[PDB]
Amino acid sequence: MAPEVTILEPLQDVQLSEGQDASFQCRLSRASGQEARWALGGVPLQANEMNDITVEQGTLHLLTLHKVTLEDAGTVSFHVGTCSSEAQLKVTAG
């Protein structure tokens, strides 16, 4: 037994009213062939001040988004030499 990149991202769809903080969580086991790539809008992103990214043991991933904005909303995409996936993050006015 020796699985490559485990793709366990229940990030099917996330909705949150404006003014509220947002956070993402996904479990991705280590790779073997190629490593998964993180990107927003199809282009690589950058963990700005508001956008901070932290990685913990167990190959755990977590997108820490502080004061979200209607502008922050968008589509996050991933590309792995083994499989591909995506998710849509929407913001509801309120």
PDB file of C-alpha atoms in Angstrom:
ATOM      1  CA  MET A   1       0.000   0.000   0.000  1.00  0.00           C
ATOM      2  CA  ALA A   2       1.259   3.479  -0.882  1.00  0.00           C
ATOM      3  CA  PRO A   3      -1.304   6.110  -1.988  1.00  0.00           C
ATOM      4  CA  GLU A   4      -0.073   9.263  -3.736  1.00  0.00           C
ATOM      5  CA  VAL A   5      -1.835  12.587  -3.134  1.00  0.00           C
ATOM      6  CA  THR A   6      -5.026  12.057  -1.119  1.00  0.00           C
ATOM      7  CA  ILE A   7      -7.829  14.322  -2.335  1.00  0.00           C
ATOM      8  CA  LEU A   8     -10.261  14.871   0.530  1.00  0.00           C
ATOM      9  CA  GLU A   9     -11.733  18.356   0.023  1.00  0.00           C
ATOM     10  CA  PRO A  10     -15.469  18.533   0.950  1.00  0.00           C
ATOM     11  CA  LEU A  11     -15.239  22.151  -0.235  1.00  0.00           C
ATOM     12  CA  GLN A  12     -18.257  21.670  -2.496  1.00  0.00           C
ATOM     13  CA  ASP A  13     -19.658  25.158  -1.883  1.00  0.00           C
ATOM     14  CA  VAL A  14     -19.285  27.852   0.798  1.00  0.00           C
ATOM     15  CA  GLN A  15     -21.674  30.750   1.485  1.00  0.00           C
ATOM     16  CA  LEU A  16     -21.334  33.524   4.061  1.00  0.00           C
ATOM     17  CA  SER A  17     -22.943  36.914   4.629  1.00  0.00           C
ATOM     18  CA  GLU A  18     -20.760  39.985   4.110  1.00  0.00           C
ATOM     19  CA  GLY A  19     -19.036  41.313   7.241  1.00  0.00           C
ATOM     20  CA  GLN A  20     -18.422  37.803   8.602  1.00  0.00           C
ATOM     21  CA  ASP A  21     -15.030  36.082   8.736  1.00  0.00           C
ATOM     22  CA  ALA A  22     -14.389  33.115   6.421  1.00  0.00           C
ATOM     23  CA  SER A  23     -12.194  30.018   6.732  1.00  0.00           C
ATOM     24  CA  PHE A  24     -11.444  26.970   4.552  1.00  0.00           C
ATOM     25  CA  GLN A  25     -10.283  23.477   5.560  1.00  0.00           C
ATOM     26  CA  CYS A  26      -9.141  20.507   3.472  1.00  0.00           C
ATOM     27  CA  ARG A  27      -7.160  17.321   4.127  1.00  0.00           C
ATOM     28  CA  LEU A  28      -4.507  16.487   1.514  1.00  0.00           C
ATOM     29  CA  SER A  29      -2.118  13.604   2.216  1.00  0.00           C
ATOM     30  CA  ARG A  30       1.465  13.810   1.029  1.00  0.00           C
ATOM     31  CA  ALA A  31       2.291  13.469  -2.652  1.00  0.00           C
ATOM     32  CA  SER A  32       4.352  10.962  -4.617  1.00  0.00           C
ATOM     33  CA  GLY A  33       4.390  12.050  -8.248  1.00  0.00           C
ATOM     34  CA  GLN A  34       3.587  15.777  -8.285  1.00  0.00           C
ATOM     35  CA  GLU A  35       2.516  18.224  -5.563  1.00  0.00           C
ATOM     36  CA  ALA A  36      -0.845  20.016  -5.714  1.00  0.00           C
ATOM     37  CA  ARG A  37      -0.846  23.703  -6.672  1.00  0.00           C
ATOM     38  CA  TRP A  38      -2.814  26.424  -4.886  1.00  0.00           C
ATOM     39  CA  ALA A  39      -4.281  29.293  -6.925  1.00  0.00           C
ATOM     40  CA  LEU A  40      -7.148  31.791  -7.131  1.00  0.00           C
ATOM     41  CA  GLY A  41      -8.716  33.024 -10.373  1.00  0.00           C
ATOM     42  CA  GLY A  42      -6.667  30.456 -12.303  1.00  0.00           C
ATOM     43  CA  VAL A  43      -3.477  32.365 -11.451  1.00  0.00           C
ATOM     44  CA  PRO A  44      -1.203  31.715  -8.405  1.00  0.00           C
ATOM     45  CA  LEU A  45      -2.167  33.771  -5.337  1.00  0.00           C
ATOM     46  CA  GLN A  46      -0.178  35.492  -2.589  1.00  0.00           C
ATOM     47  CA  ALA A  47      -0.762  35.227   1.153  1.00  0.00           C
ATOM     48  CA  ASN A  48      -1.194  38.966   1.708  1.00  0.00           C
ATOM     49  CA  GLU A  49      -1.813  40.505   5.130  1.00  0.00           C
ATOM     50  CA  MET A  50      -5.541  39.792   5.009  1.00  0.00           C
ATOM     51  CA  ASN A  51      -4.865  36.547   3.140  1.00  0.00           C
ATOM     52  CA  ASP A  52      -2.713  34.348   5.373  1.00  0.00           C
ATOM     53  CA  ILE A  53      -1.956  30.671   4.773  1.00  0.00           C
ATOM     54  CA  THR A  54      -0.803  28.161   7.395  1.00  0.00           C
ATOM     55  CA  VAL A  55       0.188  24.494   7.116  1.00  0.00           C
ATOM     56  CA  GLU A  56       0.185  22.057  10.042  1.00  0.00           C
ATOM     57  CA  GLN A  57       1.042  18.423  10.637  1.00  0.00           C
ATOM     58  CA  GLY A  58      -1.049  15.721   9.001  1.00  0.00           C
ATOM     59  CA  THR A  59      -0.615  17.708   5.807  1.00  0.00           C
ATOM     60  CA  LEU A  60      -3.533  19.855   6.982  1.00  0.00           C
ATOM     61  CA  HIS A  61      -4.309  23.034   4.981  1.00  0.00           C
ATOM     62  CA  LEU A  62      -6.220  26.134   6.138  1.00  0.00           C
ATOM     63  CA  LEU A  63      -6.984  29.380   4.290  1.00  0.00           C
ATOM     64  CA  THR A  64      -7.237  32.048   6.980  1.00  0.00           C
ATOM     65  CA  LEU A  65      -9.312  34.921   5.600  1.00  0.00           C
ATOM     66  CA  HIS A  66      -9.917  37.860   7.938  1.00  0.00           C
ATOM     67  CA  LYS A  67     -12.372  40.686   7.237  1.00  0.00           C
ATOM     68  CA  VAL A  68     -13.803  39.343   3.983  1.00  0.00           C
ATOM     69  CA  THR A  69     -15.164  41.644   1.277  1.00  0.00           C
ATOM     70  CA  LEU A  70     -17.507  41.255  -1.680  1.00  0.00           C
ATOM     71  CA  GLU A  71     -14.340  41.651  -3.734  1.00  0.00           C
ATOM     72  CA  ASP A  72     -12.692  38.695  -2.002  1.00  0.00           C
ATOM     73  CA  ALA A  73     -15.378  36.352  -3.326  1.00  0.00           C
ATOM     74  CA  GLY A  74     -14.171  34.241  -6.245  1.00  0.00           C
ATOM     75  CA  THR A  75     -13.382  30.739  -7.530  1.00  0.00           C
ATOM     76  CA  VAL A  76     -10.452  28.735  -6.119  1.00  0.00           C
ATOM     77  CA  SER A  77      -8.851  26.101  -8.377  1.00  0.00           C
ATOM     78  CA  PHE A  78      -6.365  23.276  -7.785  1.00  0.00           C
ATOM     79  CA  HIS A  79      -4.096  21.301 -10.137  1.00  0.00           C
ATOM     80  CA  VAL A  80      -2.485  17.979  -9.131  1.00  0.00           C
ATOM     81  CA  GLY A  81      -0.499  15.714 -11.461  1.00  0.00           C
ATOM     82  CA  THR A  82      -2.941  13.054 -10.192  1.00  0.00           C
ATOM     83  CA  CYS A  83      -6.340  14.807 -10.120  1.00  0.00           C
ATOM     84  CA  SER A  84      -8.054  18.213 -10.479  1.00  0.00           C
ATOM     85  CA  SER A  85     -10.817  19.978  -8.531  1.00  0.00           C
ATOM     86  CA  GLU A  86     -12.439  23.366  -7.880  1.00  0.00           C
ATOM     87  CA  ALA A  87     -14.881  25.201  -5.608  1.00  0.00           C
ATOM     88  CA  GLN A  88     -17.045  28.352  -5.695  1.00  0.00           C
ATOM     89  CA  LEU A  89     -17.128  30.824  -2.787  1.00  0.00           C
ATOM     90  CA  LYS A  90     -20.096  33.214  -2.861  1.00  0.00           C
ATOM     91  CA  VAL A  91     -21.016  36.160  -0.659  1.00  0.00           C
ATOM     92  CA  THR A  92     -24.603  37.092   0.186  1.00  0.00           C
ATOM     93  CA  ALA A  93     -25.373  40.768   0.782  1.00  0.00           C
ATOM     94  CA  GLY A  94     -26.410  41.527   4.354  1.00  0.00           C
TER      95      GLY A  94
END
